[PDB]
Symmetry: C2
Subunit: 179 residues, 2 copies
């Protein structure tokens, strides 16, 4: 399709250059279309970003059903997602810095954790707020630490990516031990 | 001084707008000096960034003596630092995305952890590489999760920042339990 082609190309251009840095020129040239066409679907470079972000977020939220009874498995899930889509990570990070719905699913997950605690599945001492934030952080550990990720090169006993995954899942297991 | 004034003003402008987005205009205007003066100390907008980043990194490294025998205390240390300097965080993040010595201190800390393991102070099963990366991640949890940080507003039982700190330190305690 053509909306799709613009979107796919906008994804790759936003991850690279961010919003201010992205060019509709390049995007249309890459999407095999014209500037005028792009602006029929989307009002503005910034409207286009918004659309892409939404689309990305929703993709994520759906890939990311939270299981309160398996938090380390949850972390592996997020790990996998960004292992797969390195540039989703770039693309939202640009947005946090450049700008500074989702809130809904968060409010929902905090309720899901409140529930886990009530049915005795997660230490009642933790604040849900802290549990959610933390697990999200740890999961984007390798996205979020590129400098160490560089050293990880041949400083790691087992370079295998799924070794990174094991550690991470094991770490989350240590924080909130499954019942 | 005048170098200092340029640097202080460059810090605040890089955190805001990043490199491509920062203006030497604004920086000199803010540092109570001129464009020509700025360019006497520094070759280029990008040279100026580099300088500021270095200066920031070194500030950090020094504030961040790693104690392998108190990793959760270590995490509190990093937490504190970025709690204090929100814009150090913005400023290096801009750099990761816009560009993409420190390596030295990392190679050093991985050795420090290798040592901890050998003298029986940190489970020998972990890869140092994973331990270092993880702890760094978790520590910038609230910097790195602004969306949840927003919800944290009055979704937290105890809004107190040092409540965030406790959780984080406790979490790191759960991962690598002190001897």
């Amino acid at each position: 399709s053509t909306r799709q082609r613009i979107v796919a190309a906008a994804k790759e251009e936003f991850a690279r250059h961010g919003i201010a840095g992205a060019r509709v020129d390049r995007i249309a040239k890459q999407a095999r279309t014209s500037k005028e066409r792009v602006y029929a679907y989307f009002r503005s470079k910034e409207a286009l970003y918004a659309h892409v972000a939404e689309r990305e977020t929703t993709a994520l939220i759906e890939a990311t059903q939270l299981d309160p009874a398996d938090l380390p498995g949850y972390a592996g899930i997020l790990f996998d997602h960004f292992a797969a889509r390195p540039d989703h990570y770039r693309l939202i990070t640009w947005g946090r810095l450049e700008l500074a719905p989702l809130q809904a699913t968060i409010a929902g997950k905090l309720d899901k954790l409140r529930d886990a605690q009530r049915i005795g599945l997660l230490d009642p001492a933790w604040d849900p707020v802290d549990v959610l934030a933390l697990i999200n952080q740890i999961a984007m550990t390798w996205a979020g630490q590129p400098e160490i990720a560089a050293a990880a090169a041949d400083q790691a006993v087992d370079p295998s990516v799924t070794a990174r995954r094991a550690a991470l899942v094991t770490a989350v297991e240590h924080m909130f031990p499954r019942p």
